[PDB]
Amino acid sequence: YQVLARKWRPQTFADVVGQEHVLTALANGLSLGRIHHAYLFSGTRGVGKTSIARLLAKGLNCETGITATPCGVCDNCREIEQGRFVDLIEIDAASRTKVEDTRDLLDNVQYAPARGRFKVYLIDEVHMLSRHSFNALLKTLEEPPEHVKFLLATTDPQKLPVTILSRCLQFHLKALDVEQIRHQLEHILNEEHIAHEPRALQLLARAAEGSLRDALSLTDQAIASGDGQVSTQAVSAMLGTLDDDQALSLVEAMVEANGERVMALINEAAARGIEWEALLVEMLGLLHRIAMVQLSPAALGNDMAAIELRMRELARTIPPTDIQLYYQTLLIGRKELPYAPDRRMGVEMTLLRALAFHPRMPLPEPE
Amino acid sequence: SYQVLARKWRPQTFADVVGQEHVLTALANGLSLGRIHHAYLFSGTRGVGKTSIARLLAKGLNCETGITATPCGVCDNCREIEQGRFVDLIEIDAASRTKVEDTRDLLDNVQYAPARGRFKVYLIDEVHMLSRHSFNALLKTLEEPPEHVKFLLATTDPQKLPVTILSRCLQFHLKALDVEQIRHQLEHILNEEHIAHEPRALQLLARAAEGSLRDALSLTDQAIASGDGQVSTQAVSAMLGTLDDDQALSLVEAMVEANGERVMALINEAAARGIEWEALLVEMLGLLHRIAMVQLSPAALGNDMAAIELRMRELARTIPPTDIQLYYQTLLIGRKELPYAPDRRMGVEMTLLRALAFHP
Amino acid sequence: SYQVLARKWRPQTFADVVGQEHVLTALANGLSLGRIHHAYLFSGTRGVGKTSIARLLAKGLNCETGITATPCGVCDNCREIEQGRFVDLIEIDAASRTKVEDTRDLLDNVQYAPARGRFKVYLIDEVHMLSRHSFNALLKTLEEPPEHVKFLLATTDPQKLPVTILSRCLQFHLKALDVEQIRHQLEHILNEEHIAHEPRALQLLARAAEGSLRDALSLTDQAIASGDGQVSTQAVSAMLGTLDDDQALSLVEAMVEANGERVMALINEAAARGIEWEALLVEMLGLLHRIAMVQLSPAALGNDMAAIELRMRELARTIPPTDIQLYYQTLLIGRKELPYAPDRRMGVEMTLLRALAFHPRMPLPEPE
Amino acid sequence: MKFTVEREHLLKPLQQVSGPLGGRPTLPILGNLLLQVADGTLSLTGTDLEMEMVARVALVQPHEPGATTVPARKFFDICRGLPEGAEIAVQLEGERMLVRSGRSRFSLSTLPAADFPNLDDWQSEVEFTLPQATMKRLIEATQFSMAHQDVRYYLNGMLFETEGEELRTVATDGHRLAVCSMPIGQSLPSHSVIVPRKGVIELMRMLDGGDNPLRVQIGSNNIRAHVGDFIFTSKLVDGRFPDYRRVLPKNPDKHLEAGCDLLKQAFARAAILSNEKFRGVRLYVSENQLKITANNPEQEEAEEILDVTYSGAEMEIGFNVSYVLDVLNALKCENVRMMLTDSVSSVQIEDAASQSAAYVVMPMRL
Amino acid sequence: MIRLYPEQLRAQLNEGLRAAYLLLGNDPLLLQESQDAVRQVAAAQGFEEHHTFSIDPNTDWNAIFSLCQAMSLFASRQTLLLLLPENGPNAAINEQLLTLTGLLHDDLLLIVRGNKLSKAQENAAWFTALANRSVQVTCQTPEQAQLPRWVAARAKQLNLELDDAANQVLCYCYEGNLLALAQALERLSLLWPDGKLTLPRVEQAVNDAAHFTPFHWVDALLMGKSKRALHILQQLRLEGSEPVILLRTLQRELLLLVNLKRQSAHTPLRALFDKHRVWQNRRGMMGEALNRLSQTQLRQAVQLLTRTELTLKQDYGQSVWAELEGLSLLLCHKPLADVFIDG
Ligand SMILES: Nc1ncnc2c1ncn2[C@@H]1O[C@H](COP(=O)(O)OP(=O)(O)OP(O)(O)=S)[C@@H](O)[C@H]1O
Ligand SMILES: Nc1ncnc2c1ncn2[C@@H]1O[C@H](COP(=O)(O)OP(=O)(O)OP(O)(O)=S)[C@@H](O)[C@H]1O
Ligand SMILES: Nc1ncnc2c1ncn2[C@@H]1O[C@H](COP(=O)(O)OP(=O)(O)OP(O)(O)=S)[C@@H](O)[C@H]1O
Ligand SMILES: [Mg+2]
Ligand SMILES: [Mg+2]
Ligand SMILES: [Mg+2]
Ligand SMILES: [Zn+2]
Ligand SMILES: [Zn+2]
Ligand SMILES: [Zn+2]
């Protein structure tokens, strides 16, 4: 019943998917004993900044000692897992943004930790602190007490002062790869004994750009929609993204200058009950993929492999100039869609623009 | 006490809601299976059932007969929620509660157990109006809240919210209701209200609803007030300023054939009769789209315009498709800038003269 | 923990101070001749030794031996200063002490004689943040301080400070340590700690430090962490690649040389970094504008940036005005149409492709 | 470490040590009082860096020696909030302090005593006992003249000079100098030190008219006062107090002896009838006559005539009413003698009976 | 009523002190050194009191009156300094000053420091009363043209040797910051006792710490020196000055230039200048600006300025400085196709 994101939070360094460089650096630092007093974590949403920070806190305060492989069973590990560890001070920058609040926070830094071996501080979205707060924090960051560790975190590291950046070891977490997201989703679903299909996992991974938290949220929503199962049809309906084959056929009809097929395809889409702007976006994405394939050969991911060969044909037959013309026509039509009398009418008129100005086979021009 | 149709016909069960089948199915399945999230964000256009669906979910969660997919609507808590009395259902306005103390007390009272129900639902409306510091402070609550509070978020546009908020919330995209759904709902409401209605009037009201059912109900109430308690086609047409005549086609023909004097005379007489200019532009856009369609496929023309068939066909035989696209583009540009023009008449005249400038 | 390099390798004597030769000589002459000014202002950038030099001056001015330019480093005062627990060494920050009450308390406490130090040195930091009231109070107390008190101001942006403070204070603005000094200091630190390293890794660390010894120390600590107790060229290069945020300049270079695969690789790296795509487009547009202005006038490239000075200069001198104009126009069009693109990533890729391998058909002013 | 006391014995010393210590501390540990139990005595020091108030209490329970620092505010609140008459047992476990009182237990976080600012081992330059009455008289005589807020930081306090078997206090604010001397009775080396305004205020606050001999220790830069089982240490304000010897006129031949009460009531009447600020009152003294007139060019001249016992040369001097009123208030007696040289000179005020205290003021030029 | 300069003030003090002194100007170093010289001469004469007060409505005056009407217990012939407010005296301050002049005493040495008074503020009752015994030392900061001679004289007084290159470097680095210039001269003298300061000597121990005003930037653009305009823009950016005031100051002169250029087709320049009542010293500068650029310019400049304002107060970005320096280069004799700047 518990949310996937909360339930499947990492509890050991092995559980973390991706971010190999930061994990290796932290493990080596803990093992060799060359531990710095201020670590800054950066990246995008849901990449695992807080997860890695909490894993490091567990490693530092573990009963067995400072190690890169915390046991996960001693009292400190359990308390940190439950978020009820007294020494692990989870602070929010926005909660205390004024200089007075951060000074009050730093007033108690000197006191020894209650039971843990370090008084770890974990500040979330540290970039929200004011300039005065940063300057006040500089002195403690440079020379903190030997039993005090700072674990800053922020999605935007460019806002921090240069002094703060130089006073701490930076670790910029990278957006997780689509394959890594898909593998993690498959692993968690298999562990939870839930039926799933490869296409559904691919669609979910594509939907989650690089944030695994978004992937987990979308997976939970798909579980709800599909009544305990992750089916390709359910995920496609929830995402509102029709199958790539229909958009590919639409663009093939558009380039061939045969409007009858275009009309039939849009009628079928209307019967299916799919928002028209999504169809236009899919057509634009297909055109962009064709243009990229023309630019470079390896421009299509394995997810589109099922339709790669066909796509390549469109790259060879269709010149680049008319590809750009079609892309621009579709983009301007999407620009005009909100002000059109109807979404169907807007898409139909955009397709008629594309056909009328078709370079190879222009629509007949009666006087 | 008398209430407007929007308040009278607010859905009270998961079956009374029209459209949005996917989100309703997901919510019902989650409630049945017990896999309930702690953050439900609803994104969509106005008048699609944000507040209605949120209140239905709150009733389902807080029902005294356990967590039920379809709340009965008769319990003490169910009735209080229906009447907006339930203390555990805190309805917060984001725009009003933007100050620091508001959010600070919002995240400080979470620890207190619910007064009456089993969940202390927080229904935050138009969440995109909250300040950035508010989102930053509420991230922790939205991530790992206690197991007695559920956050229900409603926003017209979700992209404006911080990416972290979207990450920590389950997003439900309420699809804009189509014309058929709006027409069916209006027909059902009028039949249950013992009010006579014509199919043409219902179609016109659904078309003018622009995908929002609350707007459809407001237009129906306006027609009722103006239509002496009768939803008549003539009354709705007068209220909505719909030409539904050959004036639009004649003006389009004049525009295509230059002849600025005819266009000016048509606009002058239309202004004298006092019509809606946005309706005129929409009618012209529809006619141009139909001309393009018949140029592509002659079979795509209906019989409603039979009286004006041949003349329309003449355009399909006389205007090249590129010119049709140019005229449609100019009309859309006029549509976009019509609200911002010094006057509606000035905007329409500028659009029509710009279209007149175009010619083979 | 084995301490950290920045903390361990604080310069505890004037002899072991890297760079800042002019400031060091001036301070040594002042201490030897016995002429000490009322207030000192150490300015410059971060990680150059402003705080370190201020603490060196404080410990040499209150040393048990006397006012000497070569503090012993073993007496009670020197050891206490090094440990950072000397009572008379009053280190304060303008951040949380701009309040009227706090400034008044500091002014009142100034009059009291030092506890066990020859001088009661006040090491104020970030003086440019002092409010107008606090600034005026500081000026008034600096107008005629007691003979037993001293002020060692350490700012980072003297332009904010009005020259009134300089009217009663002696400034010793530091300069960037330059690559060679930073590399030599890193080599000495690593050798003294029995740490294996390669010369190219040290060169990369020094060049990446950007004229800041503290940044170099942090970077080499990161290299040790990722290098597993040994700095190597591959480890430092990988760390820099992960930490590099100059994707806009590299993309501009690739577009200039029409290297499509390089553009794709850089876009993939930026996606891994997860930077805002509109922000990336704006940064590239600004870089193109700066290149155009540098071509117009060499002085247009301000000294505020120096890591990409050579790249900017070579790009400006190489490409002609027309090509940079076309790149700027294409990037502007791409930025404008980005909201309606199928995806932000796709929009960026499309505009990059258009700029590097296409050209827009310009309009024609048809005769009237 | 371990000891046991009664909250009745700790309510007063805790209040005393925690009194001056207020507001935020410059250093976090300065916000904490250092309590140490040793040789049957518990000493609590509420250090303020600039000032240190130490209160000592007697221990009869089987304590254990030890020292530690603890925040003053919460410890005082804990001691005060317990039931009246309840005994408090304090112990140290790990880095925390446990407080037991009957059925109640509390735990407090304690910083190490090493980080506490140590009281340096400076040896007092001049140590001597003194009764409270003499010190209180000196403070009362030489506290109204010190400048409350002056650019010259050394004039904010007042200068104590010990010479031979004599202790002298001199205070001034740029216009008047009040000097009061008292024979100590024990020969001591010559030494001068300036005590700040806050230090003397705290010292006079400590005075309570008791029989405990007040022991004063003057150091290089610190002054310490022992009263019974209480210690007050302050840091002497630096600088150099101007020598008072040059200020004292040599031969103020002109003399004026008059009833102190008469002058007091005359000045009070002038002040109440001349409440307008500025415009120092002008007094014309003549043979058996003293006419005080308001200098206010706008307000009506509230001239007041008194029959003083003066029979010398007549002259008009533009004094400040508030200054003379305060000076005469500082000298509470029945008769007062003022000695001056000429129109432009420093008139010295003294008691017609006693001459230990001198009040060399100067006229306000008109 | 003697108007003097700080350079020759030492002789005036030596020949005899005056009852009233007042330092008027904007140069900080000149004011500070004049004040120090006057105070030292007073101390040598036998004045031990150096009371200082800041004029402000919040501040009281009873202490000032008491100290001016009273001597010192252990000194005599006090000296009082008054720090005028930056904006200038107001009616209440005028009343206070004339009151002070009313009861002013010879033993008191009056010194006044503050921004130079205006023509309207120049005339006053207290000023006229003090004119009988008033010596006013002009303390304005020398112009860029006057800077090289001033620094050369300063170096010669310090027994140093400066060449043309070193003088130019010092002027460039400390333009309008003569206090920092003198401090740098002292530092260089200490570093090299020989006294010969060649170009490497000065350049290896100097920093860019000049201070400017938006009027200086507009003047630089009018002259057309790109390096100076870029340098002043950099200094203003580092000082944190907001671009709104720079944009307004530029806009005023741009509109004036556009009007002059458009209306100069058939109208004499002299009549237009007389009608506009512009500064006499700026007549030649305006003529040079007008004849340096034709109507082809002053059109993309206005459009660029409007675009800058829109992108400033609508997009709220941080690239305003880039647009400002682009416009700066445009106003100079530069091609500036304007495609980059979107003029
Ligand atoms: N690198 C990762 N390895 C494993 N699971 C991950 C990772 N990143 C995210 N997850 C999953 O997604 C959840 C959210 O991860 P968090 O680390 O809490 O997100 P976050 O990055 O801290 O949020 P931000 O950055 O403050 S918006 C975790 O509980 C995991 O279930
Ligand atoms: N999906 C729907 N199903 C049934 N009735 C609806 C629906 N959407 C709107 N309505 C009607 O419109 C009234 C008000 O609309 P809401 O339910 O509040 O939709 P909404 O999206 O919350 O409106 P906004 O976003 O606050 S302007 C309801 O009381 C219903 O009568
Ligand atoms: N000139 C230098 N010589 C040797 N080590 C240096 C030097 N400058 C910095 N370091 C090293 O960097 C550490 C921190 O340098 P700091 O002196 O604090 O830099 P900084 O000038 O104080 O930066 P600010 O003032 O906080 S912005 C020192 O402890 C040294 O290890
Ligand atoms: Mg996080
Ligand atoms: Mg609503
Ligand atoms: Mg520093
Ligand atoms: Zn463990
Ligand atoms: Zn119920
Ligand atoms: Zn020493």
From Swiss-Prot, chain A:
Binding site for Zn(2+): C62, C71, C74, C77
Part of the full-length chain shown: 3 to 369 of 643
GO cellular component terms, A-Z: DNA polymerase III complex; DNA polymerase III, clamp loader complex; replisome
Name of the protein: DNA polymerase III subunit tau
Keywords of the record: ATP-binding, DNA replication, DNA-directed DNA polymerase, Metal-binding, Nucleotide-binding, Nucleotidyltransferase, Transferase, Zinc
Annotated binding of ATP, by residue: G43, T44, R45, G46, V47, G48, K49, T50
Summary of the function given for this chain in its UniProt record: Part of the beta sliding clamp loading complex, which hydrolyzes ATP to load the beta clamp onto primed DNA to form the DNA replication pre-initiation complex. DNA polymerase III is a complex, multichain enzyme responsible for most of the replicative synthesis in bacteria. This DNA polymerase also exhibits 3'-5' exonuclease activity. The gamma complex (gamma(3),delta,delta') is thought to load beta dimers onto DNA by binding ATP which alters the complex's conformation so it can bind beta sliding clamp dimers and open them at one interface.
A GO molecular-function descriptor: metal ion binding
Subunit structure: The DNA polymerase III holoenzyme complex contains at least 10 different subunits organized into 3 functionally essential subassemblies: the Pol III core, the beta sliding clamp processivity factor and the clamp-loading complex. The Pol III core (subunits alpha, epsilon and theta) contains the polymerase and the 3'-5' exonuclease proofreading activities. The polymerase is tethered to the template via the dimeric beta sliding clamp processivity factor.
Family designation: Belongs to the DnaX/STICHEL family.
Top EC category: transferase
Assigned EC number: 2.7.7.7
Keyword Nucleotidyltransferase in annotation: yes
Catalysed reaction, written as an equation: DNA(n) + a 2'-deoxyribonucleoside 5'-triphosphate = DNA(n+1) + diphosphate
Nucleotide-binding among keywords: yes
From Swiss-Prot, chain D:
InterPro entries: DNA_clamp_sf, DNA_polIII_beta, DNA_polIII_beta_C, DNA_polIII_beta_cen, DNA_polIII_beta_N
CDD domains linked: beta_clamp
Residue span of region 3: 245-365
Pfam families named in the record: DNA_pol3_beta, DNA_pol3_beta_2, DNA_pol3_beta_3
Region ranges (2): 129-243
Localization annotation: Cytoplasm
Region of interest called 1, as start-end residue ranges on this chain: 1-120
Effect of M146L: No effect on synthesis of beta*
Residues that coordinate or bind DNA: R24, R73, Q149, Y153, Y154
UniProt record, GO biological process: bacterial-type DNA replication; DNA damage response; DNA strand elongation involved in DNA replication; DNA-templated DNA replication; error-prone translesion synthesis; negative regulation of DNA-templated DNA replication initiation; regulation of DNA-templated DNA replication initiation
Keywords: Cytoplasm, DNA replication, DNA-binding, DNA-directed DNA polymerase, Nucleotidyltransferase, Transferase
One CC-aspect GO term: replisome
Induction of synthesis: Part of the dnaA-dnaN-recF-gyrB operon, but also transcribed from at least 3 promoters within the upstream dnaA gene, induced at 42 degrees Celsius. Induced 1.5-fold by hydroxyurea. A shorter isoform, beta* is induced by UV treatment and also at low levels in late logarithmic/early stationary phase growth (at protein level). Beta* transcription induced by naldixic acid.
Entry GO MF terms: 3'-5' exonuclease activity; DNA binding; DNA-directed DNA polymerase activity; identical protein binding; protein homodimerization activity
Impact noted for substituting Q149A: Mild defect in DNA replication, impaired loading of clamp on DNA, polymerase speed is wild-type. More severe replication defect and very poor clamp loading
Known uses: Small molecules can bind to the hydrophobic cleft and inhibit binding of various protein factors, suggesting this may make and attractive antibiotic target.
Protein family per UniProt: Belongs to the beta sliding clamp family.
Protein name per its UniProtKB record: Beta sliding clamp
Gene transcribed to yield this protein: dnaN
From Swiss-Prot, chain E:
EC category: transferase
Region (Domain 3): 211-343
Region (Domain 1): 1-140
GO biological process, one term: DNA replication
Molecular-function annotations in GO: DNA binding; DNA clamp loader activity; DNA-directed DNA polymerase activity
Tagged with keyword DNA-binding: no
Catalytic activity: DNA(n) + a 2'-deoxyribonucleoside 5'-triphosphate = DNA(n+1) + diphosphate
KW Nucleotidyltransferase (keyword) present: yes
Keyword tags: DNA replication, DNA-directed DNA polymerase, Nucleotidyltransferase, Transferase
Subunit comment: The DNA polymerase III holoenzyme complex contains at least 10 different subunits organized into 3 functionally essential subassemblies: the Pol III core, the beta sliding clamp processivity factor and the clamp-loading complex. The Pol III core (subunits alpha, epsilon and theta) contains the polymerase and the 3'-5' exonuclease proofreading activities. The polymerase is tethered to the template via the dimeric beta sliding clamp processivity factor.
Domains (record comment): Has three domains, each of which is closely related to a corresponding domain in the delta' stator, despite the 2 proteins having only 6-8% sequence identity. Interacts with the beta sliding clamp via domain 1 (residues 1-140, in particular residues 61-74), fitting into a cleft between domains 2 and 3 on the surface of the beta-clamp. Residues 61-74 move about 45 degrees and 5.5 Angstroms in the beta-delta versus gamma-delta-delta' structure to contact respectively the beta or delta'.
Record-given protein name: DNA polymerase III subunit delta
